[PDB]
Amino acid sequence: ARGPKKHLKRVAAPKHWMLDKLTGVFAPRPSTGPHKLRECLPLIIFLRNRLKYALTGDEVKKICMQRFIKIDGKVRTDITYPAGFMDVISIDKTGENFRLIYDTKGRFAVHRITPEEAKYKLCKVRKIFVGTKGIPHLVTHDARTIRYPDPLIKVNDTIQIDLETGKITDFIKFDTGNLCMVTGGANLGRIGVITNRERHPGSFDVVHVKDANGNSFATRLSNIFVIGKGNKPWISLPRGKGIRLTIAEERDKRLAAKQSSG
Amino acid sequence: GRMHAPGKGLSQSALPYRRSVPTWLKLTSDDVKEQIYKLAKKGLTPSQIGVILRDSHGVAQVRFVTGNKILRILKSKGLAPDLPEDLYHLIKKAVAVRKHLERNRKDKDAKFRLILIESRIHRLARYYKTKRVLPPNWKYESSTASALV
Amino acid sequence: GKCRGLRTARKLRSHRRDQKWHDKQYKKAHLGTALKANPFGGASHAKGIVLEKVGVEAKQPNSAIRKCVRVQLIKNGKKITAFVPNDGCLNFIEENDEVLVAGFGRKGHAVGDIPGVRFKVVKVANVSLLALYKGKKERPR
Amino acid sequence: ADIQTERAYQKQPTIFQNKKRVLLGETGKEKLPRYYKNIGLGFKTPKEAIEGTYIDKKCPFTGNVSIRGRILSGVVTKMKMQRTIVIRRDYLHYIRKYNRFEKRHKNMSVHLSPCFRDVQIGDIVTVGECRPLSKTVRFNVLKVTKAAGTK
Amino acid sequence: VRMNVLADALKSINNAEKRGKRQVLIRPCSKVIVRFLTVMMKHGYIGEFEIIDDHRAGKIVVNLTGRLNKCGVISPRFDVQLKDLEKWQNNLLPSRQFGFIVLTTSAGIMDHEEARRKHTGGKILGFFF
RNA sequence: ACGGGGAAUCAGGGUUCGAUUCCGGAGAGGGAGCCUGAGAAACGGCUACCACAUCCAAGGAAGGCAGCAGGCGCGCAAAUU
RNA sequence: UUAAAGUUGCUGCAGUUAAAAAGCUCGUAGUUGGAUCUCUCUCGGCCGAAGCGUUUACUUUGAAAAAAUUAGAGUGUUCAAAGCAGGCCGCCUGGAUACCGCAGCUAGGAAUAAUGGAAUAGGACCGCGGUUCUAUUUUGUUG
């Protein structure tokens, strides 16, 4: 290739998008933006494929160009815009607010929130540095550059951002005993309390996380997102509450449902 | 069987189960070592000292009496020689076979036996150089060998 | 016997490599001399032009005349002998005709009484010999 | 000068040698302050680098190179070309049809610093990955351990 | 020369029981031999045995009860993972109702069923049925 | 001989195939050199040479289907301008 | 072209007479190699943070491993190959899971197999002394 690529094939698209084989040869290639190509949900696959407000890709454009969808408080008319983890989608015409939160199976969930909860979001801390004339600067997982933060905030922490002003209202440090969600790997979508962190200098750290039912797993430190302080999350949680059911337990829980029906 | 021969003989020594000195032998360890020093100064190898002691003084084993071996005793006193005795006797035989071989050029069989002897010499030299008994630069010279003997 | 160590894989693999060349099927397939000597060049069928009609006398104890044809191959100019299979099927072939020729069943070996013949005729002038023999099609005019 | 055997004056770029202080400083002693760093992955800087006077820019402790990547180990095979050595790595490769192994080796050229003196070709050396230092050199010696015949 | 003394131990026991003998002498003794013999004995295949001290590699006298069909060694000591044990026991054992493969694992010298109970692999020493 | 993901066969081990719609590489008749641009040594860009080949008032001008159809050729062997 | 072919044989073939052990011995690389040996010093509020135990091979575990394909769960395409849909009278519900050599990373085990740890004692552990460089606490601060 002599330059950057502009297409995406449907079998090469991220599996959690849940795209079928026989609709087309191509998939929406996400625009460049705050979230990565393989860790985002474009607006077309959310308005058309998940919410079914539109039947074709031309109808998504007609909804978008009417300026109905706000991503974290700003109107986006791009139909392949890379929305991602912890983002807030607001449709004012129907009065709906959604937050992009992984479910236990590793896929983005349709998680509706209240108008009050849509006024803030939680952001991980990626980089801290000092810029010209000694001004501290943050860089988050949302590609947000926030200057003059508290000196107690360090890398791998979580901050709360008010979407109207874009300023930090509170923060949670990274330490054992704090709630977290896994945002990658094989435990994606799982919620649990940090119990240990083993350090491997010159390589990747490992964090051990225990569920509410007593199941323990481990992840790389880059795949951990601190949610709340202690056992209490700072955001509303999806239906599964982060607990991964086994296939036998899931089978029994599904079979018990149809017996209830009658 | 034999290294360089097709023989398969079985003759050897059989140590008794008793590791203990018998009561009729009244020689103390220090007196046993004194004979070792005495016979070491008459040009006797450790294996010669052992047979002399066995045949004359009733000393079946010195490891059983003094709790040490003859070569270790000699080395502790400083009476061990430069080359080990087994390698010394192999080089002596190589010089004798090679000395017979200039007056006898048509002796094709001594020429075979000398090859076997020098192969055995090289085997022992390799073993001793791995053990840091001989310096790493030691090398057996077929012509300079008489200087070692 | 054979070596049986844990660090013997190189010995085992090299010995197998060397000893596979003593298998004549393997050598014939993998050496390349049997591919250059094959008139078809690795193909199952080939087309050619008829030069002459020949008759090959059968090997003993059989006594007959197998009716063949001499054919020059179009793609390389090589010359072969091809047997005309059924009863009276030589009467359908004429000189300077273009014929389709196939192997004769044994992968480059002669078959039966017919000595030194490895090929057989399938089609004459784009008409199969079976259709001509059973009276389904006739020679073009 | 032993330290100045090349056509260009050899110095540590971080160090300034022309601080005109006082006549007494000239009278007292002329010993340059030396730049040494802590190449750190649990490794320790040898004291022959803090007290030495050699000038070499591809040394890890007193030069401009960074150690990141892979940490490996090998046996010194040859010390012939200037200031770099050749080491050998021996490993077993698994052939799964026969369920067995075979011995293979790799020859790897590494840079040897003057802070590692009295090193012979029999001994184990730890090496760390760095940037390309020449056509076929990417590793640098980080620790020297004597061989079986240790004195 | 004598390599794999356990092979000689197991070939001597097999050859004597073909002749209908009641006792066999094994030399030299070794602790791998003793552990293998104990594994065979706890399953009822040989019976009580006894070690003779020689101030050397001792020897063993083993009583034979006529219940042994075969006891053999596998050379070399192949590494066996817990997922590759079924193939080995299909290849080596005469039935799924009797016979044992003897392995050495970090938990000790055992048979293929105790290894499955303890969830561990190892290196294959031999077999008996 | 483009490399993998993979395909056929198959008690267990194994043998053979993978030009081919997904990922990576390479090329645009053969070599070479460039301009523009964030990105090309680009060929549905330019400049030469080598091999072919087009119109001509003989002065000159213009070329690149291993893109979709289609034609010739080659073949045992492959579809609608 | 695969099986048949235990006629390429690692599993698993043959070499007295059917094809076949070098005339014989030495010898480097390669391959193989006899017994033997039963976790803790500082810190943060009885535990963790930090050192390794000689080093490995081996075994179990963990995370990291594109989708499609393959194995496999659910689902009357009218059945099936398929597909990822669908079900109830606006609601309910899926789009699982397994496998993914070798090499690299991680944490338990210590049988089997290599490897080292004191023999000019330049040995371990304890208290004792001397030579040199040197810590920048203390003289409310500054020399």
Curated annotation (Swiss-Prot), chain A:
Keywords: Acetylation, Cytoplasm, Isopeptide bond, Nucleus, Ribonucleoprotein, Ribosomal protein, RNA-binding, rRNA-binding, Ubl conjugation. Its main location: cytoplasm. SMART domains: S4. One of its GO terms (biological process) is cytoplasmic translation. This is Small ribosomal subunit protein eS4, X isoform. The modification N6-acetyllysine is found at residue 232. InterPro entries: KOW, Rib_uL2_dom2, Ribosomal_eS4, Ribosomal_eS4_C, Ribosomal_eS4_central_region, Ribosomal_eS4_central_sf, Ribosomal_eS4_KOW, Ribosomal_eS4_N. The lineage of its organism: Eukaryota, Metazoa, Chordata, Craniata, Vertebrata. It comes from Homo sapiens. Pfam families: 40S_S4_C, KOW, Ribosomal_S4e, RS4NT. Residues 41-103 form the S4 RNA-binding domain. GO terms for molecular function: RNA binding; rRNA binding; structural constituent of ribosome.
UniProtKB/Swiss-Prot annotation, chain B:
It comes from the Eukaryota. Signal peptide: none annotated. Keywords: Acetylation, Cytoplasm, Isopeptide bond, Nucleus, Phosphoprotein, Ribonucleoprotein, Ribosomal protein, Ubl conjugation. The modification N6-acetyllysine is found at residue 26. GO terms for biological process: cytoplasmic translation; negative regulation of RNA splicing; ribosomal small subunit biogenesis; translation. There is a cross-link at residue 42 (Glycyl lysine isopeptide (Lys-Gly) (interchain with G-Cter in SUMO2)). It holds the Pfam family Ribosomal_S15. The keyword Phosphoprotein applies. The modification N6-succinyllysine is found at residues 26, 33. One of its GO terms (cellular component) is cytosol. There is a cross-link at residue 26 (Glycyl lysine isopeptide (Lys-Gly) (interchain with G-Cter in ubiquitin)). The modification Phosphoserine is found at residue 29. The modification Phosphotyrosine is found at residue 37. Component of the small ribosomal subunit. Part of the small subunit (SSU) processome, composed of more than 70 proteins and the RNA chaperone small nucleolar RNA (snoRNA) U3. HAMAP family: Ribosomal_uS15_A (MF_01343_A). Component of the small ribosomal subunit. The ribosome is a large ribonucleoprotein complex responsible for the synthesis of proteins in the cell. Part of the small subunit (SSU) processome, first precursor of the small eukaryotic ribosomal subunit. During the assembly of the SSU processome in the nucleolus, many ribosome biogenesis factors, an RNA chaperone and ribosomal proteins associate with the nascent pre-rRNA and work in concert to generate RNA folding, modifications, rearrangements and cleavage as well as targeted degradation of pre-ribosomal RNA by the RNA exosome. PANTHER family: RIBOSOMAL PROTEIN S15P/S13E, SMALL RIBOSOMAL SUBUNIT PROTEIN US15. NCBIfam families: PRK08561.1. This is Small ribosomal subunit protein uS15. It comes from Homo sapiens (Human). The lineage of its organism: Eukaryota, Metazoa, Chordata, Craniata, Vertebrata.
From Swiss-Prot, chain C:
PROSITE patterns: RIBOSOMAL_S12. It holds the Pfam family Ribosom_S12_S23. InterPro entries: NA-bd_OB-fold, Ribosomal_uS12, Ribosomal_uS12_euk/arc. Its main location: cytoplasm. Component of the 40S small ribosomal subunit. Part of the small subunit (SSU) processome, composed of more than 70 proteins and the RNA chaperone small nucleolar RNA (snoRNA) U3. There is a cross-link at residue 36 (Glycyl lysine isopeptide (Lys-Gly) (interchain with G-Cter in SUMO2)). Residues 1-25 are annotated as: Disordered. Belongs to the universal ribosomal protein uS12 family. Residues 1-19 have a biased composition (Basic residues). Keywords: Acetylation, Cytoplasm, Deafness, Disease variant, Dwarfism, Endoplasmic reticulum, Hydroxylation, Isopeptide bond, Nucleus, Ribonucleoprotein, Ribosomal protein, Ubl conjugation. This is Small ribosomal subunit protein uS12. It is found in: Cytoplasm, Cytosol; Cytoplasm; Rough endoplasmic reticulum; Nucleus, Nucleolus. Hydroxylation at Pro-61 affects translation termination efficiency. The keyword tRNA processing does not apply. The modification 3-hydroxyproline is found at residue 61. The keyword Nuclease does not apply. The modification N6-succinyllysine is found at residue 53. Component of the ribosome, a large ribonucleoprotein complex responsible for the synthesis of proteins in the cell. The small ribosomal subunit (SSU) binds messenger RNAs (mRNAs) and translates the encoded message by selecting cognate aminoacyl-transfer RNA (tRNA) molecules. The large subunit (LSU) contains the ribosomal catalytic site termed the peptidyl transferase center (PTC), which catalyzes the formation of peptide bonds, thereby polymerizing the amino acids delivered by tRNAs into a polypeptide chain. The modification N6-acetyllysine is found at residue 134. It comes from Homo sapiens (Human). It comes from the Eukaryota.
Swiss-Prot record, chain E:
Pfam families: Ribosomal_S8. GO terms for cellular component: cytoplasm; cytosol; cytosolic ribosome; cytosolic small ribosomal subunit; extracellular exosome; membrane; nucleolus; nucleoplasm. Gene3D superfamilies: 3.30.1370.30, 3.30.1490.10. GO terms for biological process: cytoplasmic translation; positive regulation of cell cycle; positive regulation of cell population proliferation; response to virus; ribosomal small subunit biogenesis; translation. InterPro entries: Ribosomal_uS8, Ribosomal_uS8_CS, Ribosomal_uS8_sf. GO terms for molecular function: RNA binding; structural constituent of ribosome. The keyword Nucleus applies. The keyword RNA-binding does not apply. The modification N6-succinyllysine is found at residue 87. It is found in: Cytoplasm; Nucleus, Nucleolus. Keywords: Cytoplasm, Diamond-Blackfan anemia, Nucleus, Ribonucleoprotein, Ribosomal protein. It is linked to Diamond-Blackfan anemia 20: A form of Diamond-Blackfan anemia, a congenital non-regenerative hypoplastic anemia that usually presents early in infancy. Diamond-Blackfan anemia is characterized by a moderate to severe macrocytic anemia, erythroblastopenia, and an increased risk of malignancy. 30 to 40% of Diamond-Blackfan anemia patients present with short stature and congenital anomalies, the most frequent being craniofacial (Pierre-Robin syndrome and cleft palate), thumb and urogenital anomalies. DBA20 inheritance is autosomal dominant. Belongs to the universal ribosomal protein uS8 family. This is Small ribosomal subunit protein uS8. It comes from Homo sapiens (Human).
